[PDB]
Design a protein around this ligand. Structure first.
Ligand code: JFL
Ligand code: JFL
Ligand code: JFL
Ligand code: JFL
Lengths: 111, 110, 110, 110
């Protein structure tokens, strides 16, 4: 019970979670564990946390109304990363590699 | 807020600055499809977008908020990804410039 | 019809041609408030328009009919009359170019 | 019973009918007398005749919804003239002078 756009979004999600991107996808698979890392300010700066398993949860529950909502969550995840972090951190470069995969596949969606 | 649109204007200035010219130049003006020999560009890309258009819209005060500004900038990158195969030089350049944009846009005070 | 929009494209080419360049040049690109130092231009003119914007809209296929094209050209001329006093050179130039546009637009098929 | 905008339009119409502009307004005071002029094809080419007396009556009867509808009638009158005539005819030059008065005053509307 998915539209053809959201079927394509599910394909993108599946692509993002696949083995070939794991080397740069892994920091986004589960929520950032800010307390464990001692990032005391993380939740003061990031008011809407997002991660790939949350997106998956939402997709499996049929919560996305259209492709634009799916895209907004995925971009939120990357934006949180860029917002919180300095430009030289490993995680920013990993975000950028994964976002290239996302944006490119998202732009090839059918009309 | 005008303060949000002011910071979007700073972002736009950054994207147009000389330091990024090596990967930003293809996005300064609309794709000249007939010069390039692209008979199908306007068939495939229904809503073209480029930095000069975003400039004009910013100077005209056409953007209600930062979200509209970002939607045009991302429309520009998406058009590029949509039209092109992944190995084309312009795609590599789009990705370099989008990294500048996304990083700066995420640091916007809100 | 595409034949009416094709005729509109012909008018646009006529307005951009060298023959009219002595009076058309202020309308080629958007009014550059900065270069002119006009802090109130975008306060008074809410919807700027110019010939390159019209051209980009034509290339992008944003015009649904000839009336929409005409509306933009007339908006361009109206902004100029609105902002300026009657004895400024730009108003005389606007009027000469509008005479070309209105005449050619009146000769459209159907 | 007239809005601020239509009140301004009524002011415009008064100006177009005033003695000041009579030397180039007179051919538009009343319909083109095609029998008298010997124009057997005028009503084939011009499907919607329009003159300043028509606009006056519509204004008096409150048949204008808005200023845009008013503008459309006045512009129809000028377009009919440009449509039927070659560019060197005296009536075209008279139409152009009167249209300059109209377009300028219309652009100064509240
Ligand atoms: C801390 C860290 C060191 C590295 F060398 C590489 C990465 C990816 C890295 O990031 C993470 C590692 C593990 C985990 C957990 C514990 C949840 O599995 C999360 C991250 C991590 C994920 N995301 C999305 C982030 O935005 C950030 C940010 C940080 C981070 C940690 N310390 C900082 C410093 C930089 C100034 C604050 N940022 O760590 C992560
Ligand atoms: C065509 C091309 C060859 C290169 F080697 C490098 C670039 C950047 C490049 O792209 C452009 C070069 C010039 C111009 C001008 C200045 C004429 O408007 C535009 C582009 C260009 C900009 N943008 C945003 C694009 O999306 C594309 C896409 C293309 C393009 C041209 N030919 C293709 C092939 C690839 C499949 C069809 N894609 O060219 C551009
Ligand atoms: C300023 C000016 C002096 C001249 F002698 C002739 C022209 C055309 C002229 O107008 C322009 C010159 C350059 C440019 C550039 C290329 C920078 O965008 C624009 C104009 C111009 C174009 N259009 C369409 C306009 O409506 C106006 C209006 C003005 C203008 C500048 N200063 C005024 C004074 C009078 C009201 C305040 N009006 O300038 C332009
Ligand atoms: C025919 C003519 C000769 C001139 F030397 C000057 C004018 C204004 C002029 O136009 C008119 C003169 C009188 C009248 C009367 C009062 C009889 O209704 C009408 C016109 C006239 C008004 N308007 C709005 C027009 O569009 C046209 C068009 C013409 C016209 C007459 N013959 C032509 C042919 C000649 C090649 C085109 N056009 O005449 C008028």
């Amino acid at each position: 019970k998915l539209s053809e756009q959201l079927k394509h979004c599910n394909g993108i999600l599946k692509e993002l979670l696949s083995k070939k991107h794991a080397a740069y996808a892994w920091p986004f698979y589960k929520p950032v564990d800010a307390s464990a890392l001692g990032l005391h300010d993380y939740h003061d700066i990031i008011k809407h946390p997002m991660d790939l398993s949350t997106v998956k949860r939402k997709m499996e529950n049929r919560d996305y109304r259209d492709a634009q909502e799916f895209a907004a969550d995925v971009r939120l995840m990357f934006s949180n990363c860029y917002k919180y972090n300095p430009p030289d951190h490993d995680v920013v470069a990993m975000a950028r590699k994964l976002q290239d995969v996302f944006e490119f596949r998202y732009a090839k969606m059918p009309d």
